[PDB]
Amino acid sequence: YIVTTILEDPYVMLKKNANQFEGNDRYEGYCVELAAEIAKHVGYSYRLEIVSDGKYGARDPDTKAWNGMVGELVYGRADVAVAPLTITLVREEVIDFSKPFMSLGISIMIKKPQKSKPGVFSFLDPLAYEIWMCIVFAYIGVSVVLFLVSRFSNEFGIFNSLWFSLGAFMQQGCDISPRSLSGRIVGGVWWFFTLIIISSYTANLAAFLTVERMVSPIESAEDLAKQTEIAYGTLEAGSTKEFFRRSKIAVFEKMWTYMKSAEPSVFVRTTEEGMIRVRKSKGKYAYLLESTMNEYIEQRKPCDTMKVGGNLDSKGYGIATPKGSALRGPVNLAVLKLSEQGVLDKLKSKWWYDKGECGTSALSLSNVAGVFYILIGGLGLAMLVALIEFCYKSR
């Protein structure tokens, strides 16, 4: 018996090196295996035959004649049709389906956030580079001025002045302390500066870590309903645009009001175009499409996307058949037998996951490794300086 089908992957697709095979064996895919199982159960023979138009089916507006795969069914050409045929009222009127062998609905696709490895020197981010530079400048200036003032006209020293300033910046105490009024003035001012700077650093770091903590990634459609820095869209015209158009739900009503102000255009001519746009929008763009294709894409390398939240609507792909055919019984019963004994789950996992090309808030060592590297370098430099001093001590 002829079997109608279409080439949407990961459903029936062209087997690699198709020249070395012909007929039913010329194609492999989810629907291919499903039809194989159904044939084994009901007990008939079939010859795969792909649709010519490449369209699932729709009533031509000028002429009530159908156009597409359901067209190839309703006019007696085809015996059955195993494909992602979304069952709807118009098709149910003229073509009769079985129980849905695989359920689905509108989902959300977002760019997968790459694990942003913190910079090796991310610990300086709280303060700007200019502030660090001016800190170094001021440290040198204060040390020099303290030396100059205290020295001419005590225990201090350019080396000792630098040591005192460095230890005062880091709040680690000073063995020596100025005994002259001007030295005391400069020391107190340096103390004020270091205190303010350190408090600001700590507070800004706290702000960074707190803000980076109370961020809720888009985990639902309502979360999208309250987002403005991220835009979303659908196909140019399909069941999704119609679903939002005739939507009696408040959240989807708001999203459709948003999409009404479509400028700059969010809609897309082809699904691959939308996937590319999201993959190139750098997390500023989201897409709405069928959950099944979203899950499949989230597994086909590149792994630049993921599915969030849950299904917004409910549909079901179903096995069609000519109205008044003589296969409703066996086909429906075989579908239900397959679903009940867990074959469709196996097959879906096989084609979506098995043959897939993919798949704590405590401060981590990666956030700080810069200071550790600085410390190791300073220790090595200290060992080197000690060796040099030892050699020089020989005189």
Added chain:
Amino acid sequence: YIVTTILEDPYVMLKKNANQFEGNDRYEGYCVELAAEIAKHVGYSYRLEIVSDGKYGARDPDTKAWNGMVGELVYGRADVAVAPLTITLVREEVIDFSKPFMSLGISIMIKKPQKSKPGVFSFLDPLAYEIWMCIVFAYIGVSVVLFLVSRFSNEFGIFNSLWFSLGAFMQQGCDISPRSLSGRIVGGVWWFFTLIIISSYTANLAAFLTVERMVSPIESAEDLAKQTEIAYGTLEAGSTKEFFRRSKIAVFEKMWTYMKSAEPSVFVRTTEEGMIRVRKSKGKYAYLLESTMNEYIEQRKPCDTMKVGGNLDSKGYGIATPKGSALRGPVNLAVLKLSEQGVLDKLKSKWWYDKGECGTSALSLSNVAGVFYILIGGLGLAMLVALIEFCYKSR
């Protein structure tokens, strides 16, 4: 010409010491002054006469006969009516109004948040009282153990051990450092303890101040639509319940769905009951009523309420008149003349405000005065101790 009226305040009300006056002079209020002005403009004579039923007006369901003030109008008893007569379609059909002399709409009333004076010792709230107690206990224990260990079998001392521990807790440097292994152990452990404790104190204080900063008081109706710790309600049955019932708006639809789950009952039998309920609910209860009464109440002592956001709907109090009367022209024109030359604003300010019985995030000195008091007390104790030591030095 007879004038119908009602006793809702601050509109026409009973003048204090009514025995010493009679007739029109027996009453004072907003509507009284408004009618006085209208009489002076149009040029007729009037005698105030209050309604008997005390009801504004509504069509009796059993008999289509009216019931109330509009009843006193439509049946020829009364010539005009100056009162908070909300103009609606049913009344417009049978009684004819003028242009609204005073606009209004549904508002929100919330308990006024008293200026919570921070406790004199609010600076200890970051840590619990138990933690402070155990800090004192541990400080004593560490000082004693350090003395004991270092002493038997140096420069230290029970007084000096206490001093060292106290200065180590406060990170203010130590004059003397233990030179014995056990002393060093105890000192290091005390250092760890104080460091952790201080960091925790500072962080928890930061959390307090940050949380107390990102609190948005109810400033709109939508803010109420997303609140669950605060409940709200209306009168048992009125224009407000009807407004929410026949509401085609999303926010009010959500609020009406909420009020559908009225348990525990939020609706109120009388407006004074609702005001009392809010005044006793300690900021956990809000009320919905006409903006005018809300503003008036926010000025009548006690000053335990305030109005938030803006009007949810739009209505207007209007001067009524019998259908087909001979006063529409003059009354409407006088109302508009009064509104245009700014009399109604004056009168409203007079009766709502003039005769009313009422009317930065930097850390303030009140938040910290406790430590200042502690410091002054410590300085006084220090001066006393110095005097005692001086007297004792005489021996």
Added chain:
Amino acid sequence: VTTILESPYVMMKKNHEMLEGNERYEGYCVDLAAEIAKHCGFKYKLTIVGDGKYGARDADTKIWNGMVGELVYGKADIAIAPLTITLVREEVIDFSKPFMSLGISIMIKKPQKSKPGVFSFLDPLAYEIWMCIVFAYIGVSVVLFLVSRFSPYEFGIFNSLWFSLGAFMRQGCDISPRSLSGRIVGGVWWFFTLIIISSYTANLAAFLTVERMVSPIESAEDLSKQTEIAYGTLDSGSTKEFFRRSKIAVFDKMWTYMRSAEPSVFVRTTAEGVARVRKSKGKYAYLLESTMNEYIEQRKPCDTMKVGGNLDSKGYGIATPKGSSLGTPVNLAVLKLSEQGVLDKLKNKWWYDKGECGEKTSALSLSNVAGVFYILVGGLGLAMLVALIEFCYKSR
């Protein structure tokens, strides 16, 4: 049906020339006319006034212009436009109950993150606290000096000040009191410093974590005393007359202020006022009708906001020539539509639904913390100068 073109009430639909009929127009009043017809059940064609104004009494000709002129001279039957109900027009035509209430409001630039000023590092703590800190530092230094000098058990005045200052900055102290009273003072000062610094750091973190842009004015009285931000209405318009014809003193003061204007705080067009406030960088505030203000607050670039509440009250109403057999049905239709929950729907659809507009914090910049650098360099200069002066004095 005569209307006027003012947005959003009557505007040219997409493809103003490619769209013909009643679909050429879009806006609030179009939907309102449709809803009014759905009850009246009349036949109408969208139209526009000729002169270009809503309507007014001619200075000398006394010929009604605009919508009122068209209505009173049989050119049109009904009018649907933002007509400000008033006595003068009520004398010649019969309005309906207002289908939208409004009043004078206040328009300002949406406040932004002002460039942090020098000495912004003191924002976390109030100046009262800083003054009390200085006073307590002086007092504790003095008390310690007294106790040390009178009960010696060396802490001079200068060394006492040095010790206290180094204590307040969590730095090492070369000398520590050996007298019990001195120890009392030191411990108390230490507690004070610890608490104060922790509070400073925490409040600074709170400031840096959440941003709160607060408008300088909350109402008309707020800026009636500001005396810093210019505010003026149209050079000639209804609001100017309202302020002029006011009898309430709070607005009288504002009117007097607007009278003594240098430069004249007035404009010739609403777009002029919008541009002025947008380019005045938070120095000009415009008073206009709350409808237009709420409208602008929802249009790009969304650089402005409405503040305060309405000062006066007005209304927009359908108009109709005297004796028309259509005044009563249109009045009833307006009212029933109003209480049916529609005008709110239309206002939301046009003002808000068709709205041009409905964060990882940043590192600290020198602008935030330059004041302490200035203080540091000033202290260095002062110290060099003082050492030089002491050297010169001791030299002689």
Added chain:
Amino acid sequence: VTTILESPYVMMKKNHEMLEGNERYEGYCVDLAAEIAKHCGFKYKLTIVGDGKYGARDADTKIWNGMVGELVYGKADIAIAPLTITLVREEVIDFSKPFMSLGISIMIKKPQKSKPGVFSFLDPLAYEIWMCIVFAYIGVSVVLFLVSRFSPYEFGIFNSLWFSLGAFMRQGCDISPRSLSGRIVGGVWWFFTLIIISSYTANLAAFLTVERMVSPIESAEDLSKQTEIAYGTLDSGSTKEFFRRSKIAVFDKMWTYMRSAEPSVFVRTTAEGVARVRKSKGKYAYLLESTMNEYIEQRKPCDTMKVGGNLDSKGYGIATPKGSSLGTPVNLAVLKLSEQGVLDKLKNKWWYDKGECGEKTSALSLSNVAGVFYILVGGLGLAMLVALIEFCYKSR
């Protein structure tokens, strides 16, 4: 119209005895039957099954019971209830397209603020960081000791350790290196300490500011390896058979785990499972139909949540006896209603709208910080013991 009583699908309206007729009942299936009638245009009376079950094949009698029994024996015409479409019933009656899809899901207790454990003060920093801190402390102490001993320019091993430790704790140091290399080491250590402590404090503030209760499990595979939280279905039911009749290994492992149960991780009733999970204090997870789980998550006290995604897929569908002249119209009505945007509306109204449920932080308690107290007392005991041991040793 035969239905079954299971909430929310068919429940007794307010005043079950005072309300008579078709208004005696309320729920989702009531509205669904009304919507189906509004298209079919039939006459129906609400009814309930007698046996008390939806329907099943008798063990030996083979007499259909429940809704299926009533339908197949002429007792009722159509059925509207949460009937799990399946082959066995599809053999005897003709369903419609599913009006609600579902599957097995996971139910747990809503995670709460666990009492802070001892040593919770280390949460801000990962254990890797603590270990690296200790290693760096040891290394810097050793390097300083080497440099001091070999270039004396006294810093012994013990004094070097003391200096480093007092540096890491922002405390005064009695000795400071006078050699340039020692100064290098000291300054580097000082920088490290400053950064580390500031990071600790900031991360702790972040922890205390915002609470994030994270479920321990994210899916079925998540708890398939947990081996800590018990999870079991009904002792006998559809889910038990599904796990038993599974061919996929991830569920095979869970099935084997449920087989070797001690005690038996199973219940006799759904209310039993709900009570168990509510009283198991986050130690039991229940697997049931996602509809019932979403239902429970919206009913008081709201002490539970649904986690993960559906494992299997099923559907609820209208039922109808074979050859009925009403199967096709009801199928078409179900489908048209589904795509018309209704079943979603009803589900929202019943599951969510009629939902039992849709903060000034607190001071720190000893439970948060008791670990450091324990460490302090342990250190005191150790120090007394060590001093005693040294005294005893030196005495002899």
Added chain:
Amino acid sequence: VQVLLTTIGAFAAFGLMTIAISTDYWLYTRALICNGLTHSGLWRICCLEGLKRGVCVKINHFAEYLLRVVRASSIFPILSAILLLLGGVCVAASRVYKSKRNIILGAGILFVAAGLSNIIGVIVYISANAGKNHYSYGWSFYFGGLSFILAEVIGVLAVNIYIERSREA
């Protein structure tokens, strides 16, 4: 001279600690098991201002396992009392059979250990007790605190006596 002060303080501290352990007047809290205010104690929670006033019984105490165990067996307060008693006995034994110069040292060691034991017991009690309902601490708790303070003072005084006496040699 100071031996008398030491001995009387040791006796007072032991009496205070034994009284605090004995008395069921540690906590003042509003509980629900009584069906109401309650002066809960270390051993038996005992009702007040209720129908079952006076009629009162022991409590039911059921990583955290270990905290429950130690709280139920108040071994640390008991250890503090025992160490206080043993140290007082050691002081008495040092008053006689003198010229040992190693007994009062042990007495002070025991007093310090008793102080630490009391601190640990208090920490454990408070940590386990906690798990808004206002409450307060009875004078049994303050008796324990006074006992700890006296233990510390007695330890320091005893070691001071020891060092003075051993300074003779």
Added chain:
Amino acid sequence: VQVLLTTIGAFAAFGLMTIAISTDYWLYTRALICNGLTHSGLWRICCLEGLKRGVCVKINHFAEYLLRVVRASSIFPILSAILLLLGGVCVAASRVYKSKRNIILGAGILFVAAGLSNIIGVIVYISANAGKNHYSYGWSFYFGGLSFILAEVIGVLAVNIYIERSREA
């Protein structure tokens, strides 16, 4: 001996600072006035990689008033250069007409003051410049930094020379 090092360092620091002030190579930023990358400078912003390449002009600089004023009149960098020059002149005048023991002291004072002036000028320049658009600092800025470093080193060396020479007496 060290006098030569001091003098050459002073000359180098003055040359570096004068070059940095002169060169319009302080900032690398993408601006919009040019209609684009730009090597903005202290005095005149000068375009690059654009239609008006090379054709470049002075800038328009218009509490904060005072910052704009001081930034426009780069008096602090100029003061640093002037103080460097005057200190070098003082060092030269101390090389001759020696036995004063009060000239190189002033030289070091001036060098330190020049360092502080350079620091102030840098702070002011950066604060006023700021007001995401990436940018970078040209080698004029690093020349100013090197001049400051040399000024500090020269000040310390000069005062060390002074103290050594005055230690003779």
